[model samples]
Target chain A: MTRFDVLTVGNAIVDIISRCNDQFLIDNQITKAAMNLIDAERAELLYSRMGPALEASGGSAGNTAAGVANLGGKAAYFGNVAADQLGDIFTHDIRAQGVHYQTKPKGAFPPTARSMIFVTEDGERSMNTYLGACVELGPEDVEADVVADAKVTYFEGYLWDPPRAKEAILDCARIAHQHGREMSMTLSDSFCVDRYRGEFLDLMRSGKVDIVFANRQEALSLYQTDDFEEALNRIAADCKIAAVTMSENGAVILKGRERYYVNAIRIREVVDTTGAGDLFASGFLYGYTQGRSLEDCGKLGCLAAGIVIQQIGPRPMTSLSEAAKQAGLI
Target chain B: MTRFDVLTVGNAIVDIISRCNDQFLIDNQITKAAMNLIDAERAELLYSRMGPALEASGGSAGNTAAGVANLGGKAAYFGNVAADQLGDIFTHDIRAQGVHYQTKPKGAFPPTARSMIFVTEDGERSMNTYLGACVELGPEDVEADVVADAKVTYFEGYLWDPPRAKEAILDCARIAHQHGREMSMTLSDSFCVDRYRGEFLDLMRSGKVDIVFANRQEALSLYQTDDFEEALNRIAADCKIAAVTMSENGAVILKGRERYYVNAIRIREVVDTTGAGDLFASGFLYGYTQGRSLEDCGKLGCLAAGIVIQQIGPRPMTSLSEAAKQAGLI
Candidate 1:
């Protein structure tokens, strides 16, 4: 039996979130609703120009691990951060969420990774990330035992942009398969999918990833098509199981010839959509490991995503387990 | 006319805010609804055991400066922080709100100050503060020209805890008075009032402080009495002007023999009361500097405090000016 439900790997980042109007996005030449990788200098320039912000621990897989833990699933995490205050914050926040994070902090230069997330009034978040020490995540950082002890080893496509994180993730995936565990990956964002479409497709088709997660735009970007149905079909054909979210339109899940369509849960007000996809993956993966039905998994995903969008920040401040229980979804 | 309306001086600290139940407070031996000074080791131990938290730039006077700026008041700030990431966050947040902050960061030694604020379901916050580089703030850090150029030089009574900061505050008070400006200070907290009761009384009686701010508990603590009315009457006798808040009961303003009582604004919910007093001081000082009536100043204070307690953090995320305009208070 697996000791952990999921082991997530990606960059360890502190999210610097600030509110701005659409004009601020246009003035900075930022691509709306996309993740833009920035250099150290560019990060400084943007931060200096940005409005007052609050800091929260965030990274695609980090937020996923937090969600899994919050949902009462045993979760482990692998990522790199520098030995700085921001790194300390990231480490403390994730570990305090009950996620087992053992990746050691880099002692020397570059500093912890940070994302300057600009949340517009419309609840759309455009992220500008600085890789920083995240680029130093080599294969040596991945623990074989940790990966093998989990039911599923999951990672984010954003890891591919961080130089050696891809190697670390590949190594984790190999170890998980060796231990008869499943491997999962999220197409982090449409921009990320555009940057590594071929590699992502190869992983899905070659069975390196058994389950795949993506939003509507990422699925379309991966298939280089404007039609979401065609993109969904292509992803379903490539992977054993696929979950694609369409924001308020709901989500579609595929397993062989069987399919499940789950409606998005209604939210009174969408405050910020920063962690919608990461949290959706969290609920889906948590339900999957608990042996829930595909339909139940999709419903769980929507439930978690719905709660996250009603508040600010990428991680939920409340317990997802209690929320699930209250909603009679557990 | 003065270049700035309010010049605030206090410790520059980043707030690590987390939500916990009352049981956690009992288990941790933390005093409820008060700020406790913790050393470095205790800060680390408490932080390690804490639940997931979010970071915001917060300090009593820092929040006041932010409120003043948000109310369209010209504001400047003096504080000490290390040349570190947390310091950068504190500086950026305050400056981004249009408050002038020219205090240079400490290059070495103790890092920036931080307060681990644990908020309970009752919206009460228990603060555990670690005075790091904030202890380095001395008379030298106070820019004489900047202090003299402000209409009012305000600070928190918490400055008395830092050895050198007291000297700085006194110097600032003298400079402000010499330039025909006013000096103001908040009692900060009941515990802080207990710590410097004698010195605080001396300051008020000696005519160094033209205006004094305090809450019900702080007023009672200052006079070492349980009688709120007696405390209010005594404070009125000692200070030129006094503003005393009584939570939901409202606030009272005393100027000479004349007095004004203002009702607290109604709030749908009180999320966190961390910056209630600080923001109240913000609105009051802004109104006072603008030559508004004492009754109007108290009303403005109540309005700002009402908006702040409805949010999670110490600083207001929205514009106080817009809210004032909407309420016809401006």
Candidate 2:
């Protein structure tokens, strides 16, 4: 048996979340519900124009890793954050969540990565991320033993933006397969899928990726088709297991010959949709690692996603363990 | 006419709030429902063991100032914070709330002050504060024009611990009175009341303080009496206007021969009792400055306090104006 359940590799980011109306989004020319990678200067300019923010530890895989840890899973994380106050906060918050993080801080050439997340009243978030130190993540940061020791190795497509982060995840994927561990990849965003469509398809078809996570928009963008069924079929044919979320409609899961339809849990009010998919992956992976049925895994994913959307930040403020127990998922 | 409604002088603190159980408090030797001044080493030790924290700008008078601003009152703040990131955060949050804060960053020797607030399930918070750069505040930092420009110059009793801060408040009080403005003081804590009882009494007797804000416990401690009525009567005789909060029981307000009893608004849940008294002062001061009746001011105070205790942070997350409008206080 592997020592760890899931090992997540991606950028380490602190989310600076603030509330703004839809007019602010339009005035700033920001596309709602998308992550826009901004330069350091742009990050500064955007921050100056934004309202007061609440800082929280957040990133695609970091949040997924945090959720796994919150659910009593043995999770380890690999990412880059400079040795600054924000980096210290990110490290302390993730480590306090019981996620194993041992990456040493590098020199202060680039500061820790931060995402200026503007959350609207409609629960849509426009993320402006400054890569900063996250761009420094290379093959050297990827731990071979750590990747091989985990039952599953997960990486997000956002890492593909950085030249060296791409190399690091490629190395991690190879190391995981060498030790007979499963590999999961999440199409981080619809734009990310569009940017790395050919490369992502290659990974899924070549069997470098086992499990795949994506939202409805990402599914359509990945297959070069606007039809949802056609995109789902293409993903099912290419990947070993695929999970596609439809925001409020629900989710569809495919595993070889088995198929499951999971209902999205109802939330009275959705404060922010920043981490819904990330947390969904966390719950599904947690259930999968525990040998649960595909249907059960999808249900768990919806439960986790439901909890995070009701709060302002991406991470869970309450005990996920107790929540799962109450939902009768554990 | 006064340009500002209130100008507050106190320690500018960033509150790092974490959830903890009662046993955690017992094990850490923390006094429940009290603020303990701690050294840098102790602050570090406590923070290392605490769970994930949400950072918010907080100080007794600072919260009052922010509350006044949230209620559409023109307010300003004076406090000390180093040229660090936390200091930047404290400045941004207050400024974003429409509270004028022009205190320049001083020497970098001491960083920004922080309070490690451990909140239990019952909504009671045990705070461990590290004064840090706040101790650098002196009489020179207090601007005479700013004090005179505001109708009320408010300060907290916690400043009595820092000799320089005490001098700054005294100078501010003198400046405000010289300009024919009122000076309000919050007792801060029962322990603080005990430490500065003699000096606090002297300020009231000398007519240096016009309005006083204190919880029931602080009022009882200030008069060296166990009975609430005795403490209330004593305070009424000494101070021009006195507001004594009785936690959930409500508050008693006294002005000369006239008195009023204001009931505390019932909240379905009390998230944290961190800023109840500070917010009460904000509501009362906001109303008091606007020439509202004493009973209405007390009701506004109860409404503001009720809203904050339902949230984790001391700052009001929602618009206090809409809440007042709904309560028919406007």
Candidate 3:
């Protein structure tokens, strides 16, 4: 069997980014530092009027997959895109970063998922995403080989935002279990959790998810409790490994009865949040695929998330070799 | 007639906060660092599961209004809540902050909006909210007298979240115009913009929205463009005042044809995105109420957002007056 380190499944998005002013934000009426999923029509209308955007291929899972590849691990990705400009961009970007992409495209809605990011002066990112082709991801795309060959098959909760994406995510998880591969998941955004709380609960109950990633809010909401300790205790009983990230406080890793709280990796300033969470996952999953201890994975996640926020966009603006060395990942 | 500096309309949520680890996040399967609306059933379950939470009244617009009040500005608020624990909590919290509250609670679904914030050691927060009594806020709550009493009526874009909240926001805008008061809005969250793009465009075109608070991505998505500069130009052409916040780079402020790009008020790390935008509005509007020009107002916003992020929660953990004095707000 062709083995891989990690496989990611989610929408394939090409991010178009630029710097913006407050009035621009006001006129649009967007909440600063939040990600909104847009439609193809809105994406076209918005992009048609904007200036040249610095293009980067991005997507929740795609970025994580790329991060795994960047760490010199074998990574595979599953999603859908049209044979359009953005789709090509997505393919090129992920592949160039050394990820495996077998997702095909059809001439469907507008194109692939395209996101517009406004990087404010302080490096906070406001996001408008069009999960166009992402909706096309379904169970059929969760190929068994991809699951069997990978050390871990990862999925994004945002996949549930679109209908078929849920089925596809389930398929990936199932295949991973059938092949006895570890499975990981990210609670993509807090709002998304609100939409799919039921399904997510079921996913966790099945023990289909081996590694779970959530920011503070998502975890609290999922359990619908106030005491963080209570939530932690409950989750410990359910999942095998849980990596909870707090933006600045760092993160905590829960494995069986043992739990480790890793402090945030120090940074001079916060630049953008574009892919901080995803990048953290990249680091943690990279560590996981390498059989690193849970605590070490938390530290690596903090390191990756810290570095990503120092610059704009979701992908790293700096090289990882030195960073891993600094984090003792090397 | 009683005069006020600012009036805010949005969901009225009480924030219940705690700290947690990864297992807490995973067993629940939550997305980190996003504002999510939940139902009463889930809220109850989570509340039961949660450890003791630090109670603080919170909501995007509500926080902004309270912040303005804390800045020694006359701030009034409009939102709905039912007569329940969460409702009473929200009412007491905002009132304690010294913001004017005239909207009466309703005998409606559940109680007041309750948000549970899970703060991790890294200082990041993840939120899960139950609109509960907040759902009662509708067009009926847009009282003419309260809206007319304010120099500027500020609304959180999340108001558009509930279908009925849209009507209420528009009503407030109309009243603000009828009374010759300026209108200010915050794109409270990115997903909110995604759900209400067309209506927002219409609102902008109608000249009901005068000042807007947004981050880069939110602005880009609303204008359906990737070019931040181009988006700013269009918004400037269409609006009177704009305050755009950049995470690390600072902010961009636009008044009529002229614009100022200010560096982000730097912070060692970002704890959560909850109050970043709200506090930006608080600082800017506070400055505006005090007769500071657009440039100073933008700078104040930077200072304010900078302060809240350093500590935990969305509200200022420190005295706003004291911090403002440090930042030269006095």
Candidate 4:
């Protein structure tokens, strides 16, 4: 029997979020609205000076897993976290939300991963991530049965940093493909795409990646082109289906020669726009698993993503199933 | 010689806030919309199971101090915090917000006080506070010069839980009164007022409190009456001026036979109600120090409070001075 609808493999991080102004970014020498890798010393220095922060379980794929589970979809997650207080929080939250999280924590490893997220006045989140214990993840942690049982196996690009996590994820993708499962991947950050541009292109062209998720910046960066149409044309040839999001303009889904456009769900206020893309993937995956039309899948993605951007964190505060039903997505 | 408009003395706390539903409260056996006292053990257990959270430096009087500073008032604060990471966050945030904080962290004590606050769907916050290092506060921590220098010395009723803190605040009140400055007190919570109803009444009736701040619930509990009118009349007879807030119905100012009603500034959303009353005190105190009319002061109070309740934390995220001018309160 089939088990999980989606399986996400990535880092497990506690997002330590604090709201700040543009001036704070300038004063602290932070690159505004970008995710930057930070070492332990820098993490300590920045955290010591930053304002009080809230902690949320938020890896890119973790956010997707949470969203999938929140929307009444079966989701499983594979990500390593140290056996520390923050890791315990991450474990309890994801597991409590119905995402099957069975990744064992290694006590001898470093503490759990943490991202110091500074949400500026305009709702843009600048992430300073410390990949504390995520480095401990390797191919041995990847279970073949879990990947094989999942309908779609999604991986995050940020896992490329620790090298071994990237290796483990590739194996997971191989196992998923071996069992006739569709494999998906997100261009987690624009910089991440820039770092692994050739490898991402190879993955898409070699049929290793069946589905791709990305925003405008990531889409442009993937093709190394500024033109949106050019990137679309390039991706359409390599990938079987890709969902591309444009902030206020909504999203577009491509399936070979066919393309479907969906409007972004307008929210009254944009509180924090941290997990828009991840939840978009969540909705798309949920709809795709149920064998919905490409247009409907993209619409569901936009609706769910809109719900996420309205709240403080990546996860939707409102029930996604209820929100979906309200929007007639269900 | 009066360099500060308001100097507040209260516990220093970092609010670890998470959004939850009514069911989560029931599942966790939490008292809805009430402040529950938690020890270190319970704090650990509750936090371990709670969902992702955002944090802000929040204590009743601390929020008030931050609001006063946000309104361009010269605000100073006195409270105890341990030399811990959370404490450092509290110190940096308050100081950065323009509130003068000079409380030295005594390392040889418990960690900083933390309130695990859960904001439900309707924006009501249920707080579970662990006193921690706040109990280490005593009369000796109070500086006579700082208390005497302020135009108004404001304290919170929650200090009553820590017996030594109560003694310290009483001494602060005495110093303020001796220097011919107004002494202000907020009935922080209804249960907090109920715990020290006798002492709170004595403070009002004996002319020790010049201005009293409270909400509808606390006002009713303080008078041991269910009727709002009875409590209003009783408080009018005791304190010189009492500002009483009634959630959606707005607030009323009582002074002898004269009374003024100020409508609550309607907001599109109420994100959190944790610091509504504290911010009300901030606006009223800010206006009072600047020689505004009683009605104007009351109106400013409502406006400031409305702005506060629209966000997650108690402190003003926007510049209160600019907001006041836009509303023509200045």
**DockQ for model 4?**
0.27
Candidate 4 collision pairs = A53-B55, A54-B53, A54-B54, A54-B55
* Two-way lDDT contest, 2 vs 3, winner: 2
Each candidate structure's TM-score, on Cα atoms with residue i matched to residue i, is 0.99, 0.97, 0.50, 0.88
Which residue runs does candidate 1 get wrong by more than 4 Å?
A: none
Task: Give a tens-digit lDDT track for model 4, residues A1-330.
Answer: 689999998889888788887888898888877778999999988887776455567998998999999888999999999876567668877886789889898883688898999998788999999998999999888878889999999998888888698789778878998899999999889998999998888888888889999889999999889999999988888899999999999999999999999999979898899999999999999999988999999998999999999887778766899989998989
User: In CAPRI terms, where does candidate 2 land?
Assistant: medium
Candidate 2 global CA lDDT score: 0.90
Pitting candidate 3 against candidate 4, the one with the higher lDDT is 4
- True lDDT of residue A116, candidate 2: 91
lDDT of 4 at A109: 61
For DockQ, candidate 1 versus 4, the one ahead is: 1
Which regions of candidate 3 are displaced past 4 Å? A21-27, A44-52, B1-330
Q: Pick the candidate with the highest TM-score.
A: 1
Pick by DockQ: which candidate is best? Answer: 1
Q: What TM-score number comes out for model 4?
A: 0.88
**What number of clashing residue pairs does each candidate have, in the order they appear?**
0, 0, 52, 4
> What is the Å distance of residue B17 in model 3 from its true position?
44
Q: What share of the true interface contacts does candidate 3 keep?
A: 0.00
